[PDB]
Structure formats: C-alpha cells, structure tokens
Design a binder for this molecule. Structure first.
Ligand code: AKG
Ligand code: ZN
Ligand code: ZN
Lengths: 250, 253
C-alpha cells in the first residue's frame, strides 16, 4: 500500500496534465509511452538533506564507461564493476534506491551468464557554478560494447535535492538519436557551428524540477541540463524493463 | 622473526640445494633469478586439512581464463572477474595461505588502474580430477592483443601453490627451460602438439621434474613453460601468483 504524490505529466506538444499517483503508476505511464516525462513532489521540505546524507551512500558512471574504447574500455569496465561491488550494498539501503525497488520490485542490472555481477545502482551528483541521450546499448566502441539491446522506454530518474538560484532546469527534444555515432555527429555539428539544425523545428518540453521533486523521463530523447548560477545537488539512476523485470543502473 | 622451512632450490641442469629458508628468502632468490623453482615443507602432517577448510575460502574466473577472451566477450568477462574478486577477497585476505605471503613480503592484492583501485582475485583452491597441457603464466599474455589492458611483462612473475592432497599417481609438474613470447606463441604450440604429438622446441630444452607432496609449497618462475601430469585420483592445491611492482609485492590469481 503505497505512497501517493502530486505529479505533472508532460508530453510533446500536448498540455501538461496534473495528476496524483504512486511511483509505480508514473513509471508504468512512462513505460506504456503515455508520457515523455513526469515530475512528482516526493520529499517534504524539511526532509531533503536527510535523503542526501543517507548512510547507505558510502565515481564511474555507465555513460562515462560508454565513451571508452579498446584496452581503455576493458580497464574502465574493471573499475566500474569493481566499484559497484564495493558500494551497491549500501546503495540498496538508501531511501532513493528503495523508491524504485519498493515500487517495481526493481533489482540492480546484472551482467554475466555464469556469475551475475551488478552494475552501479545510483550516484549523487553535485553541479558547481551539450545535448545527450542515454541508452544502455550506446557504447562508442560498437564491436566491443557488450550490451546490444536498446530499450525504447529506457528511463532516467533523478531527485533534486538543492536547486540553483537561476532555477536551472532541463530541456528535452522530440528527437531520438539512433546510436552513439549519431550522437557524436550532432556533437560535431554543435562544436563546428554552435547549432543542431534538426533541433530547430523539433517539438520540446521544458522541465524545472524543484528540490524534493523526482523527475522521471524517457532518456532516449535528447535532453540538456540548463547552466546553473549556483550549487545544484541531485541523486539519479536509470531504469530498463527487462525480460526478468525492472533493473536499475547508473 | 620469521619461520624458516626446509627448502629445495632447483636450477636447470644442476643439483638441488637443500637449505632451511624463510618464505621471504625463497621469494627473493626467485625474484633475483637465482633459482627456477623452490619446494618448501610448510605444513606438517597434522594440519593440511585445516589450510583447505579455512573459513576465508567460504565463500571463480581466473586471470588466465580472462586472458582467453576477445572483444566484447573480454569486456563482459572482465566485469565478471572484477565484480567477483571484491566479493571473494575479503575472505581470501584472511586465509592462512594468503597471509603466508602478505606476512612475509608485505604483499597486497594487485589492483587495476588506480584512480579507484579495484582488486584482482587474490587466489584459488583447485581440485584436479582423473583426466585421460603445457602453458606459461604472464599477466601480459591476453589473447586479444590490442584490447588486453595489462601490457607490461614481469620476467620474475612467480606461481606459488601449496599441495593439500596428491593423486595416487603422485602426479606432479614438469617445467622446461623455454619461455614463450606471447599468448599467440603459446596458442601455436597448442596447435602444434594437437597435430604432431610434440613441440619441436621442447626437445632441446632442459626440464625440471617436480613431485610436490602434501604440505609442500612450490614457488616457481611462471613464464617458463610447465604442465601438470595426468592425475589418477583427486589432487587438491591452493595457488596464487606474485609480481614485484614498484609499489611492492602484489598477489593475483
Ligand atoms: O595447482 C597447481 O598444481 C599448479 C597449477 C599451475 O600450473 C600454476 O600454478 O600456474
Ligand atoms: Zn541523461
Ligand atoms: Zn601455471
């Protein structure tokens, strides 16, 4: 019997809906492709810092691991999976991770047929004063990347703990790059002209997550974090709905 | 003050020297290229079961198994290897076998790529059962040359294994005075003997035949080709490898 929370449901070029729902129901709305992003008021104002100082929080992300090639990919994978082995036991315990493992019966993503080892669960991110999309299969080194299945409804979930003075949010475009190369090419176009031609007439959503707000979104859509004037602290992970169930990783 | 143990020190083509030695002294002589293999009597007849039953072992992918993978299966097996090592090593750290070396040499687990330092697997227990191949061990010998991330060879890399139970056969170890240059050279010797029975270069090479007994620790330069004989009954050993890095002695399996 699960908590229920105010939620704003966003979809490209349609009016933002206001609803009130469980974490489970928001994630299922996303997974059914009935929303592009959903912003929920999760943590009451006097309780935010405790989610950050959660004892279970005591690095290398999948997105960083993905940018690596050749021997460097093998080495950085050793580091990524070695850290995950060290930290996930505590991470499982945090309030943040438990939102998802309670609501979905989610478990850490695992790799290996013969022994199953965990991806990293989640990270706390601090921002101090270019578009990407996240897809578990988008390693730069195609031939060596071992995750080949793309999940169309891959989700990002981040809880904002401390907002910036400028109330710097997140932009998402109705544009879903087909691979890492495709994203590298747009980067190239941005760092050669400053624009991405295709983003011009592309439908878009503006999000302004506040502290205590959990933002859930389809991460395959191109998106960017606005520049902050001030300290921004978030906690984040990603979700894919695999054949064995919901799996978390970051 | 360190225990000394009876030791046989072997060098190719020459009579074995008997010496009582500490673990550090045998390791230093190997690292100095003053011996090819040393066999030491470590654990007396009361106690061999205890070293195996050590709670540090309860409760693996080996580096040599990892080295056999290529491309995406290498990235995958390495996740398994390093993800597993961290579960298993806290216990292994504690085992009297591993302590034998970490006490003697101030050895630590080998780590990779230290911004974060994650551990290699420390060691293994090995059961060999009745079975109707010549290899060498060198941390650099990944089959997939471009993607294997440990590109430095250590010429004094050591293998160390304690025998716990010997086959009825008294199956032991042969080591030749031959050091293959890479994983491909070794792979070609495997192709050669499967098509030929023998290995052209081995009939010119001196060989040391070893028969280590329960309780005995065999330390040797693992870059020399070696092979364990066919066992008639179950044989049990515990093993790891050592390299002497700029930061000190490191242990991995
Ligand atoms: O466990 C043993 O008998 C020795 C195995 C071996 O070949 C090694 O130590 O590399
Ligand atoms: Zn993202
Ligand atoms: Zn060997």
């Amino acid at each position: 019997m699960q908590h229920t929370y105010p939620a704003q449901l966003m979809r490209f070029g349609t009016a933002a809906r206001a609803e009130h729902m469980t974490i489970a129901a928001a994630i299922h709305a996303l997974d059914a492709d009935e929303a592009d992003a959903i912003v929920m008021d999760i943590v009451p104002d006097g309780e935010r810092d405790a989610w950050w100082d959660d004892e279970g929080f005591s690095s290398v992300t999948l997105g960083q691991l993905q940018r690596e090639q050749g021997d460097k990919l093998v080495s950085k994978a050793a580091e990524y999976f070695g850290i995950a082995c060290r930290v996930n036991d505590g991470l499982r315990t945090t309030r943040f991770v438990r939102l998802f493992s309670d609501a979905l019966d989610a478990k850490p993503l695992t790799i290996g047929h013969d022994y199953e080892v965990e991806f990293l669960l989640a990270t706390r991110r601090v921002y101090e004063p270019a578009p990407h999309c996240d897809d578990v299969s988008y390693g730069r080194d195609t031939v060596n990347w071992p995750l080949k299945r793309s999940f169309p409804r891959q989700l990002g979930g981040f809880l904002t703990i401390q907002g910036a003075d400028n109330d710097a949010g997140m932009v998402m475009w109705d544009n879903r790059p087909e691979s890492r190369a495709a994203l590298d090419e747009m980067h190239a176009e941005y760092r050669e002209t400053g624009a991405i031609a295709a983003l011009e007439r592309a439908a878009k959503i503006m999000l302004k997550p506040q502290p205590g707000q959990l933002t859930l979104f389809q991460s395959k859509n191109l998106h960017a974090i606005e520049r902050c004037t001030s300290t921004r602290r978030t906690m984040g992970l990603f979700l894919i709905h695999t054949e064995d169930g919901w799996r978390m990783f970051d």
